[PDB]
Design a protein that fits this description.
Elements (H helix, E strand, L loop, with lengths): L3 E4 L3 H13 L5 E4 L2 H8 L6 E5 L7 H10 L8 E5 L4 H10 L3 E4 L4 H15 L2
Parallel strand pairs: 1-2, 1-3, 3-4, 4-5
Helix pairs in contact: 2-3
Length: about 120
Amino acid sequence: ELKFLVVDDNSTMRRIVRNLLKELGFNNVEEAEDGVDALNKLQAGGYGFVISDWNMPNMDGLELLKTIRADGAMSALPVLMTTAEAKKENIIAAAQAGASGYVVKPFTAATLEEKLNKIFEKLGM
């Protein structure tokens, strides 16, 4: 029942991640095309977890996270960052920006499941 918000400007990837969540049980998934479109929905309330790509137009992954964290209403949302390669500086920036975790594409449902569990475990959910 967790309402997930999947943010990626690549329609296919949003489809991949959605099927992976569904494969793990989560079907209350929503999709956004970029940080801005995500903020428009997140502000509508209802979401309990965010998964975002690092590179998107209008508002990228790192700015969307700073924006989310900076907003009191959206301060507690777990944010999982998806990336390619995952170079140190990025992990460090995502880390200091307050990311809940990051995963490198292409990941599998098994890999996604592990990440979701480390997050939930810390959060107790």
